[PDB]
Short mmCIF file of C-alpha atoms and ligand atoms in Angstrom, two decimals:
data_model
loop_
_atom_site.label_atom_id
_atom_site.label_comp_id
_atom_site.label_asym_id
_atom_site.label_seq_id
_atom_site.Cartn_x
_atom_site.Cartn_y
_atom_site.Cartn_z
CA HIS A 1 -1.62 22.99 -18.65
CA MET A 2 -0.84 19.79 -16.58
CA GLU A 3 -1.29 19.84 -12.81
CA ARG A 4 -0.72 17.61 -9.81
CA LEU A 5 -3.98 16.66 -8.75
CA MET A 6 -3.72 15.31 -5.09
CA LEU A 7 -6.19 13.35 -2.87
CA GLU A 8 -6.79 12.04 0.44
CA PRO A 9 -9.01 9.00 1.52
CA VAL A 10 -12.27 9.62 3.24
CA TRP A 11 -14.93 7.43 5.10
CA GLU A 12 -18.22 9.39 4.02
CA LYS A 13 -21.98 8.44 4.20
CA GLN A 14 -22.85 7.47 0.90
CA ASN A 15 -26.23 5.69 0.33
CA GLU A 16 -27.99 7.38 -2.25
CA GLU A 17 -29.40 4.64 -4.44
CA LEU A 18 -28.16 -7.49 -11.36
CA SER A 19 -27.94 -11.05 -10.07
CA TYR A 20 -25.20 -13.38 -9.14
CA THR A 21 -24.09 -16.73 -10.29
CA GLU A 22 -22.26 -17.24 -7.11
CA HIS A 23 -21.76 -15.48 -3.54
CA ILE A 24 -18.46 -15.76 -1.78
CA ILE A 25 -17.65 -14.34 1.59
CA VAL A 26 -14.30 -14.69 3.25
CA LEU A 27 -13.67 -13.92 6.89
CA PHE A 28 -10.20 -12.83 8.10
CA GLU A 29 -9.75 -14.41 11.66
CA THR A 30 -13.15 -13.41 12.78
CA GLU A 31 -14.85 -14.90 15.63
CA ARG A 32 -16.20 -18.35 15.69
CA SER A 33 -19.57 -17.24 16.47
CA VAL A 34 -19.66 -14.87 13.39
CA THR A 35 -18.53 -17.71 11.12
CA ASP A 36 -21.36 -20.13 12.18
CA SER A 37 -24.00 -17.33 12.33
CA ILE A 38 -23.14 -16.26 8.80
CA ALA A 39 -23.01 -19.72 7.34
CA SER A 40 -26.34 -20.51 9.04
CA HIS A 41 -27.93 -17.36 7.77
CA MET A 42 -26.43 -17.25 4.33
CA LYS A 43 -26.45 -20.62 2.99
CA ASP A 44 -26.75 -19.53 -0.51
CA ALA A 45 -23.11 -18.25 -0.32
CA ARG A 46 -20.04 -20.17 -0.14
CA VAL A 47 -18.22 -19.21 3.17
CA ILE A 48 -14.46 -19.28 3.71
CA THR A 49 -12.69 -19.05 7.11
CA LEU A 50 -9.23 -17.97 7.34
CA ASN A 51 -7.75 -18.45 10.73
CA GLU A 52 -4.94 -20.89 9.88
CA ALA A 53 -1.68 -19.26 9.35
CA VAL A 54 0.99 -18.87 11.96
CA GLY A 55 3.26 -15.89 11.66
CA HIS A 56 3.79 -12.11 12.51
CA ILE A 57 1.02 -10.11 10.81
CA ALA A 58 2.59 -9.75 7.62
CA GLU A 59 3.23 -13.33 7.21
CA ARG A 60 -0.42 -14.07 7.91
CA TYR A 61 -1.57 -11.71 5.31
CA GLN A 62 1.03 -12.72 2.71
CA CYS A 63 -0.60 -16.24 3.45
CA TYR A 64 -4.22 -15.01 3.24
CA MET A 65 -3.38 -12.95 0.00
CA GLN A 66 -2.11 -16.21 -1.60
CA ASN A 67 -5.40 -18.03 -0.69
CA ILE A 68 -7.58 -15.27 -2.13
CA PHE A 69 -5.30 -15.21 -5.17
CA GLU A 70 -5.64 -19.13 -5.78
CA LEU A 71 -9.42 -18.63 -4.85
CA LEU A 72 -9.64 -16.35 -8.11
CA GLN A 73 -7.45 -18.59 -10.20
CA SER A 74 -9.79 -21.55 -9.69
CA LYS A 75 -13.05 -19.74 -10.20
CA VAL A 76 -11.64 -18.25 -13.35
CA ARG A 77 -13.75 -20.27 -15.67
CA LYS A 78 -16.95 -19.30 -13.86
CA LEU A 79 -15.92 -15.67 -13.99
CA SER A 80 -16.18 -16.22 -17.72
CA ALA A 81 -19.33 -17.65 -17.54
CA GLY A 82 -21.34 -15.54 -15.18
CA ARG A 83 -21.21 -13.09 -12.38
CA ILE A 84 -19.97 -13.24 -8.94
CA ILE A 85 -19.75 -11.51 -5.61
CA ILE A 86 -16.80 -11.77 -3.06
CA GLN A 87 -17.04 -9.89 0.15
CA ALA A 88 -13.99 -9.93 2.67
CA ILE A 89 -14.75 -9.36 6.34
CA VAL A 90 -12.16 -7.58 7.96
CA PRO A 91 -12.66 -6.90 11.67
CA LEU A 92 -10.92 -3.70 12.88
CA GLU A 93 -8.69 -5.01 15.90
CA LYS A 94 -5.31 -4.73 16.96
CA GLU A 95 -3.38 -5.86 13.76
CA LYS A 96 -6.28 -7.31 11.97
CA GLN A 97 -7.02 -3.98 10.13
CA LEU A 98 -4.09 -4.55 8.08
CA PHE A 99 -6.12 -7.36 6.12
CA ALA A 100 -8.10 -4.47 4.69
CA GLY A 101 -5.28 -4.27 2.16
CA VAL A 102 -6.84 -7.14 0.49
CA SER A 103 -8.55 -4.42 -1.32
CA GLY A 104 -5.65 -3.99 -3.73
CA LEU A 105 -6.12 -7.29 -4.74
CA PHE A 106 -9.87 -7.15 -5.13
CA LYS A 107 -9.51 -4.01 -7.38
CA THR A 108 -7.18 -5.60 -9.69
CA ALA A 109 -9.34 -8.87 -9.59
CA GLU A 110 -12.27 -6.68 -10.92
CA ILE A 111 -10.26 -5.04 -13.69
CA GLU A 112 -8.83 -8.50 -14.94
CA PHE A 113 -12.38 -10.16 -14.60
CA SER A 114 -15.42 -8.31 -16.24
CA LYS A 115 -18.12 -10.06 -14.16
CA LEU A 116 -16.67 -9.94 -10.68
CA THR A 117 -17.88 -7.73 -7.77
CA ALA A 118 -15.59 -7.57 -4.77
CA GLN A 119 -15.82 -5.71 -1.46
CA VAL A 120 -13.94 -5.44 1.40
CA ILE A 121 -16.10 -4.77 4.52
CA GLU A 122 -14.57 -3.83 7.73
CA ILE A 123 -16.44 -4.30 10.92
CA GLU A 124 -15.50 -3.13 14.35
CA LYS A 125 -16.95 -6.03 16.27
CA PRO A 126 -18.96 -8.26 14.11
CA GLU A 127 -19.69 -11.16 16.21
CA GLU A 128 -21.49 -8.80 18.27
CA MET A 129 -23.84 -7.47 15.48
CA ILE A 130 -26.60 -10.11 14.57
CA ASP A 131 -27.89 -7.93 11.93
CA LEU A 132 -25.05 -8.84 9.80
CA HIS A 133 -26.60 -10.84 6.91
CA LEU A 134 -29.04 -8.14 5.65
CA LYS A 135 -26.20 -5.61 5.33
CA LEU A 136 -23.81 -7.98 3.39
CA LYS A 137 -27.22 -8.82 1.61
CA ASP A 138 -27.73 -5.07 1.29
CA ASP A 139 -24.13 -4.30 0.53
CA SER A 140 -24.32 -7.00 -2.29
CA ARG A 141 -27.07 -4.96 -3.85
CA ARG A 142 -24.81 -1.79 -4.26
CA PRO A 143 -22.05 -3.38 -6.23
CA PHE A 144 -20.44 -0.21 -6.60
CA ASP A 145 -19.50 0.18 -3.01
CA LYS A 146 -15.70 -1.33 -3.02
CA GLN A 147 -14.75 -0.21 0.57
CA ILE A 148 -17.13 -0.18 3.28
CA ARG A 149 -16.93 0.35 7.09
CA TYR A 150 -19.26 -0.66 10.10
CA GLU A 151 -18.37 0.81 13.52
CA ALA A 152 -20.79 2.65 15.89
CA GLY A 153 -24.04 2.14 14.22
CA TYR A 154 -22.46 3.75 11.38
CA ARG A 155 -22.34 2.72 7.70
CA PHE A 156 -19.20 4.34 5.77
CA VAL A 157 -18.01 3.91 2.22
CA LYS A 158 -14.48 5.11 1.12
CA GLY A 159 -13.93 7.62 -1.56
CA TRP A 160 -11.55 10.55 -2.24
CA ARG A 161 -11.53 14.21 -0.88
CA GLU A 162 -9.26 16.63 -2.75
CA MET A 163 -6.49 18.45 -0.94
CA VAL A 164 -5.70 21.91 -1.71
CA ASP A 165 4.15 28.90 -1.57
CA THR A 166 7.58 27.59 -1.29
CA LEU A 167 7.57 24.23 0.79
CA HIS A 168 8.45 23.55 4.49
CA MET A 169 11.02 20.55 4.68
CA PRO A 170 11.82 17.67 6.93
CA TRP A 171 15.59 17.72 6.55
CA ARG A 172 18.12 18.08 9.51
CA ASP A 173 21.37 19.34 7.92
CA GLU A 174 23.09 16.86 10.17
CA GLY A 175 21.55 13.50 10.94
CA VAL A 176 20.87 9.96 9.40
CA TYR A 177 18.23 9.24 6.51
CA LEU A 178 17.78 5.50 4.93
CA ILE A 179 16.21 4.53 1.87
CA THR A 180 15.17 0.95 1.51
CA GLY A 181 15.39 0.09 -2.29
CA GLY A 182 17.70 3.30 -2.09
CA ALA A 183 19.98 2.19 -5.23
CA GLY A 184 16.75 2.27 -7.37
CA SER A 185 15.89 4.99 -9.66
CA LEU A 186 13.47 6.63 -7.09
CA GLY A 187 15.77 6.26 -4.18
CA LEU A 188 18.85 7.88 -6.08
CA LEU A 189 16.62 10.78 -7.02
CA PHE A 190 15.48 11.32 -3.23
CA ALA A 191 19.34 10.78 -2.41
CA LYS A 192 20.46 13.72 -4.38
CA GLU A 193 17.39 15.82 -2.89
CA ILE A 194 18.68 15.12 0.29
CA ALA A 195 22.21 15.87 -0.95
CA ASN A 196 21.23 19.23 -2.39
CA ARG A 197 19.26 20.14 0.80
CA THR A 198 20.90 18.59 3.58
CA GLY A 199 24.68 20.00 3.95
CA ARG A 200 26.17 17.52 6.11
CA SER A 201 23.85 14.72 5.86
CA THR A 202 24.28 10.75 6.25
CA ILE A 203 22.18 8.63 3.62
CA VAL A 204 22.25 4.98 4.20
CA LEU A 205 20.74 3.24 0.62
CA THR A 206 20.04 -0.17 0.98
CA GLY A 207 19.13 -3.16 -1.46
CA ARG A 208 20.05 -6.58 -2.38
CA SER A 209 22.30 -6.09 -5.31
CA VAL A 210 25.86 -5.66 -5.28
CA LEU A 211 26.39 -2.14 -6.84
CA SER A 212 27.21 -1.79 -10.44
CA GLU A 213 30.23 0.57 -11.43
CA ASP A 214 27.53 3.22 -12.82
CA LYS A 215 25.59 3.05 -9.63
CA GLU A 216 28.88 3.79 -7.65
CA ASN A 217 29.63 6.45 -10.24
CA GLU A 218 26.18 7.88 -9.79
CA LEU A 219 26.71 7.41 -6.01
CA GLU A 220 30.12 9.19 -6.03
CA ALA A 221 28.56 12.58 -7.27
CA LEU A 222 26.27 12.54 -4.07
CA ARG A 223 29.61 11.98 -2.10
CA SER A 224 30.66 15.30 -3.75
CA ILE A 225 27.78 17.52 -2.11
CA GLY A 226 29.67 16.51 1.12
CA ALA A 227 26.95 14.26 2.11
CA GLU A 228 28.06 10.76 3.48
CA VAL A 229 26.51 7.93 1.70
CA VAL A 230 26.88 4.09 2.69
CA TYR A 231 25.49 1.08 0.72
CA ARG A 232 24.35 -1.61 3.18
CA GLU A 233 23.40 -4.28 0.62
CA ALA A 234 20.54 -5.98 2.90
CA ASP A 235 17.15 -7.97 2.06
CA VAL A 236 14.45 -6.33 3.75
CA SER A 237 12.68 -9.97 3.80
CA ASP A 238 15.31 -10.99 5.93
CA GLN A 239 14.62 -9.96 9.47
CA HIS A 240 18.01 -10.36 10.65
CA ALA A 241 19.78 -8.45 8.02
CA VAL A 242 17.38 -5.65 9.06
CA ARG A 243 18.43 -6.09 12.53
CA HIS A 244 22.18 -5.79 11.76
CA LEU A 245 21.68 -2.90 9.53
CA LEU A 246 19.90 -0.87 12.02
CA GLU A 247 22.16 -1.71 14.81
CA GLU A 248 25.40 -0.87 12.49
CA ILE A 249 23.39 2.13 12.03
CA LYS A 250 23.15 2.80 15.86
CA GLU A 251 26.63 1.66 16.64
CA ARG A 252 27.97 3.73 13.65
CA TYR A 253 25.81 6.72 13.96
CA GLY A 254 24.13 8.93 16.62
CA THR A 255 20.56 8.32 15.41
CA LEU A 256 17.94 7.55 12.54
CA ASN A 257 16.32 11.09 11.41
CA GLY A 258 14.27 9.44 8.60
CA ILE A 259 13.19 6.36 6.63
CA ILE A 260 11.98 5.94 3.15
CA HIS A 261 10.67 2.55 2.56
CA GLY A 262 11.17 2.25 -1.50
CA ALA A 263 12.04 -1.43 -1.60
CA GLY A 264 10.08 -3.41 -4.06
CA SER A 265 9.16 -4.35 -7.59
CA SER A 266 6.30 -4.97 -9.78
CA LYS A 267 6.06 -8.07 -12.02
CA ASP A 268 3.25 -7.73 -14.56
CA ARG A 269 1.27 -10.58 -15.05
CA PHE A 270 -2.51 -11.53 -15.18
CA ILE A 271 -3.93 -13.38 -12.15
CA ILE A 272 -4.53 -16.41 -14.56
CA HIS A 273 -0.90 -16.75 -15.54
CA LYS A 274 0.83 -15.76 -12.34
CA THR A 275 2.96 -18.24 -9.98
CA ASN A 276 2.73 -18.44 -6.40
CA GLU A 277 6.36 -17.62 -6.34
CA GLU A 278 6.25 -14.50 -8.24
CA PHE A 279 3.23 -13.30 -6.09
CA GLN A 280 4.98 -14.08 -2.91
CA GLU A 281 8.01 -12.29 -4.18
CA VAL A 282 6.27 -9.06 -4.91
CA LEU A 283 4.56 -9.12 -1.60
CA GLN A 284 7.89 -9.57 0.62
CA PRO A 285 9.71 -6.44 0.35
CA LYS A 286 6.57 -4.21 0.89
CA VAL A 287 4.90 -6.58 3.47
CA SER A 288 7.25 -8.34 5.59
CA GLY A 289 9.96 -6.02 4.62
CA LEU A 290 8.16 -3.15 5.83
CA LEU A 291 6.98 -4.64 9.19
CA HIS A 292 10.77 -5.93 9.69
CA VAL A 293 12.01 -2.46 9.20
CA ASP A 294 9.25 -0.76 11.18
CA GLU A 295 9.91 -3.20 14.25
CA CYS A 296 13.64 -2.81 14.19
CA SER A 297 13.79 0.87 14.17
CA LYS A 298 10.98 1.24 16.70
CA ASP A 299 13.26 2.67 19.42
CA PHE A 300 14.67 5.42 17.22
CA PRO A 301 13.72 9.08 17.58
CA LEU A 302 12.46 9.45 13.90
CA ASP A 303 11.22 12.76 12.28
CA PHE A 304 9.32 10.50 9.58
CA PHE A 305 8.59 7.23 8.29
CA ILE A 306 7.44 7.45 4.81
CA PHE A 307 6.20 4.52 2.53
CA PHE A 308 6.68 4.44 -1.30
CA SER A 309 3.26 3.04 -2.20
CA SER A 310 1.66 3.26 -5.59
CA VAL A 311 -1.64 4.34 -7.42
CA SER A 312 -2.07 0.57 -7.94
CA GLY A 313 -2.56 0.03 -4.35
CA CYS A 314 -5.77 1.97 -4.36
CA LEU A 315 -7.07 1.65 -7.96
CA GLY A 316 -5.92 -1.95 -8.53
CA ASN A 317 -4.14 -2.47 -11.83
CA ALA A 318 -4.40 -5.04 -14.71
CA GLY A 319 -1.61 -7.41 -13.81
CA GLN A 320 -0.56 -6.23 -10.66
CA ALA A 321 -2.69 -8.00 -8.28
CA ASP A 322 0.29 -8.66 -6.02
CA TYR A 323 2.01 -5.36 -6.28
CA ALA A 324 -1.59 -3.87 -5.51
CA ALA A 325 -2.13 -5.83 -2.32
CA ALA A 326 1.65 -5.09 -1.08
CA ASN A 327 1.21 -1.71 -1.72
CA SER A 328 -2.32 -1.48 -0.04
CA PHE A 329 -0.79 -3.11 2.97
CA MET A 330 1.65 -0.39 3.23
CA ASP A 331 -1.18 2.10 3.09
CA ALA A 332 -3.29 0.26 5.89
CA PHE A 333 0.24 0.08 7.85
CA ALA A 334 0.42 3.88 7.74
CA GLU A 335 -2.56 4.37 9.70
CA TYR A 336 -1.79 1.45 12.03
CA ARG A 337 1.58 3.12 12.77
CA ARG A 338 0.01 6.37 13.91
CA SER A 339 -2.15 4.51 16.41
CA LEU A 340 1.01 2.98 17.81
CA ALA A 341 2.72 6.43 17.86
CA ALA A 342 -0.54 7.61 19.97
CA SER A 343 0.30 4.74 22.26
CA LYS A 344 3.58 6.39 22.26
CA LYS A 345 5.41 3.04 21.19
CA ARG A 346 6.44 4.42 17.83
CA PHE A 347 8.18 7.77 17.04
CA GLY A 348 7.82 10.29 14.23
CA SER A 349 5.16 10.79 11.49
CA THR A 350 4.02 8.02 9.17
CA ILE A 351 2.82 8.61 5.51
CA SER A 352 2.13 6.39 2.53
CA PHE A 353 2.35 8.01 -0.66
CA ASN A 354 0.22 6.60 -3.78
CA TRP A 355 2.77 7.73 -6.63
CA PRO A 356 1.89 7.71 -10.13
CA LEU A 357 4.09 6.93 -12.73
CA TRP A 358 7.43 8.90 -12.41
CA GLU A 359 8.89 10.68 -15.44
CA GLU A 360 12.30 9.24 -14.73
CA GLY A 361 11.56 6.46 -12.26
CA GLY A 362 13.12 3.22 -13.61
CA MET A 363 10.86 0.17 -13.28
CA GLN A 364 8.38 1.24 -16.12
CA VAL A 365 8.49 3.89 -18.78
CA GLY A 366 5.46 4.84 -20.39
CA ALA A 367 6.13 4.62 -24.03
CA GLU A 368 3.01 3.77 -26.25
CA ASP A 369 1.06 2.73 -23.20
CA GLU A 370 1.91 6.30 -21.92
CA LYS A 371 -0.82 7.27 -24.28
CA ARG A 372 -3.69 4.85 -23.15
CA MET A 373 -2.86 5.73 -19.56
CA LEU A 374 -3.37 9.26 -20.58
CA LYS A 375 -6.54 8.52 -22.57
CA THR A 376 -7.54 5.62 -20.22
CA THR A 377 -6.93 7.81 -17.02
CA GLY A 378 -5.75 11.29 -18.20
CA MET A 379 -2.50 10.67 -16.49
CA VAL A 380 1.12 11.67 -17.41
CA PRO A 381 4.53 10.73 -16.48
CA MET A 382 4.95 13.02 -13.38
CA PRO A 383 8.12 15.16 -13.59
CA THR A 384 10.65 15.21 -10.72
CA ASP A 385 10.19 18.49 -9.15
CA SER A 386 6.33 18.27 -9.45
CA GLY A 387 6.96 15.03 -7.42
CA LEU A 388 9.33 16.43 -4.88
CA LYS A 389 6.81 19.41 -4.41
CA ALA A 390 4.15 16.53 -3.97
CA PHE A 391 6.41 15.04 -1.40
CA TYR A 392 6.99 18.01 0.63
CA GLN A 393 3.19 19.31 0.38
CA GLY A 394 2.28 15.39 1.57
CA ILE A 395 4.48 15.96 4.62
CA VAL A 396 3.02 19.14 5.99
CA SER A 397 -0.58 17.87 5.67
CA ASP A 398 0.30 15.10 7.76
CA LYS A 399 -2.06 12.26 6.60
CA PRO A 400 -1.24 8.86 6.95
CA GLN A 401 -2.10 8.48 3.13
CA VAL A 402 -1.60 10.73 -0.13
CA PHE A 403 -2.72 9.66 -3.43
CA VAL A 404 -0.68 11.66 -6.08
CA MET A 405 -1.70 11.98 -9.70
CA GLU A 406 -0.23 14.08 -12.51
CA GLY A 407 -2.23 14.65 -15.72
CA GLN A 408 -5.18 16.45 -16.97
CA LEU A 409 -7.33 17.64 -13.89
CA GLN A 410 -10.83 17.14 -15.38
CA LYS A 411 -10.24 13.77 -16.91
CA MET A 412 -8.61 12.57 -13.51
CA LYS A 413 -11.62 14.04 -11.31
CA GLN A 414 -14.01 12.59 -13.60
CA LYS A 415 -12.85 9.10 -13.39
CA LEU A 416 -12.12 9.37 -9.41
CA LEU A 417 -13.79 12.65 -8.23
N1 LIG B 1 9.08 4.36 -10.68
C1 LIG B 1 7.80 4.89 -10.33
O1 LIG B 1 7.51 5.58 -11.23
C2 LIG B 1 6.94 4.54 -9.34
C3 LIG B 1 7.60 3.75 -8.15
N2 LIG B 1 6.62 3.23 -7.09
C4 LIG B 1 7.35 2.89 -5.94
O2 LIG B 1 8.41 3.43 -5.25
C5 LIG B 1 9.47 2.49 -4.89
C6 LIG B 1 10.73 2.99 -5.81
O3 LIG B 1 10.52 2.66 -7.12
P1 LIG B 1 11.57 2.56 -8.18
O4 LIG B 1 12.79 3.22 -7.63
O5 LIG B 1 10.97 3.34 -9.56
O6 LIG B 1 11.68 0.94 -8.72
P2 LIG B 1 13.35 0.35 -8.60
O7 LIG B 1 13.00 -1.34 -8.94
O8 LIG B 1 14.13 1.01 -9.60
O9 LIG B 1 13.45 0.26 -7.27
C7 LIG B 1 13.10 -0.69 -6.20
C8 LIG B 1 14.70 -0.84 -5.59
O10 LIG B 1 14.29 -1.88 -4.53
C9 LIG B 1 15.16 -2.74 -4.19
N3 LIG B 1 14.83 -4.00 -3.92
C10 LIG B 1 13.84 -5.08 -4.32
N4 LIG B 1 13.45 -6.00 -3.58
C11 LIG B 1 14.38 -5.75 -2.47
C12 LIG B 1 14.22 -6.34 -1.07
N5 LIG B 1 13.76 -7.61 -0.84
N6 LIG B 1 15.30 -5.73 -0.11
C13 LIG B 1 15.62 -4.89 -0.23
N7 LIG B 1 15.72 -4.24 -1.50
C14 LIG B 1 14.91 -4.37 -2.63
C15 LIG B 1 15.73 -2.96 -5.76
O11 LIG B 1 17.16 -3.77 -5.82
P3 LIG B 1 17.63 -4.92 -5.65
O12 LIG B 1 16.85 -5.54 -6.79
O13 LIG B 1 19.06 -4.76 -5.80
O14 LIG B 1 17.27 -5.51 -4.10
C16 LIG B 1 15.53 -1.88 -6.51
O15 LIG B 1 16.68 -0.77 -6.43
C17 LIG B 1 9.05 1.13 -5.38
O16 LIG B 1 8.38 0.52 -4.21
C18 LIG B 1 7.64 1.64 -6.22
O17 LIG B 1 6.96 0.18 -6.07
C19 LIG B 1 5.41 3.58 -7.18
C20 LIG B 1 4.79 4.19 -8.37
C21 LIG B 1 5.56 4.62 -9.41
#
């Protein structure tokens, strides 16, 4: 009576149909010209210009996310008082696409702040367009438009198109797979699965912690299947550690056949209480960590590079501003990596999965809240085979982003369409 519902993001034309105490617009390394024109034209809105950070793209994202984050915190008393609109202007460009991830943060902010409207607006070349102010003004008039795209005289909104035997699989019986966050509860599950499927496989599990006894004990059974498993105890935030890990991979082994990026963690707190330190700490593994991995494994002939993202990244979730923006960055990265592959610069197919709560994933366990989330969302703790099935189905479809939900269909579809 429960079924996986399974979704896939779409840019659609969808323009079928109160007043703001405040109007804020944030520009992500937009053109100087753009900045000035907008301020002049929109002097009834505050305009913030993020151009300021130095780092790789991930570094700049983490920085700007913190700036958005500190902005909300401050305006917190206002949000109580009255309505507000923030619009983020993201130019589609070489890497600036990734800032579109700020959408995870905006969705969480909306859940936590009743009277906030937050829109992310991606623009192919905003400076060149000087019709811009009316659109922003016009977009401000349709609050329910959360993600909006302007390119080629086109105005798109993001929404969810549904996706619809025994499953094909990506496994090479010999050859190397790593799972960052591999000693975590999901990385072990996928470890076993590889073990069952693989035959003579090599599985490199990595994380920060020294292994506890039970982990090694849990690990040892997988050694039983005849797969060879090595725990490399590295921090994905540390670019050099990642480098070594990949090289040892290279020196040690023929090649890499596959990567799951499963490193990360959520730390629940409302934006009002959260520290900068905690905020950065949950961004790190999924944002910088992911970049670092991607760039160190660039020269490998991969069959796949799959990110383990979350339903939080695309819906937001109360108390997970940081987890959602981290996860949204990964989603945005999936498309960005594919483009690179078309350039021929990167090898293998890239997918980001928006996972729901797993039945026996560690991290969270549903318990009493399970019920609200079923009542709030119609979602249930997702069983492991259902998950593995969705995992295999997601690969064959070959989309950069797959959103997976398990629960009662009509409730789910009703909330999301
Ligand atoms: N569990 C679930 O139901 C769901 C999971 N997901 C996502 O799937 C992935 C797996 O989740 P799950 O296994 O349940 O959660 P866990 O916390 O059990 O797994 C995360 C693992 O990542 C490791 N890790 C954390 N930070 C770093 C870092 N900086 N560098 C390297 N390793 C790191 C942790 O180990 P250590 O602390 O030793 O470094 C931990 O083992 C996560 O990214 C999660 O966000 C998404 C939706 C639902």
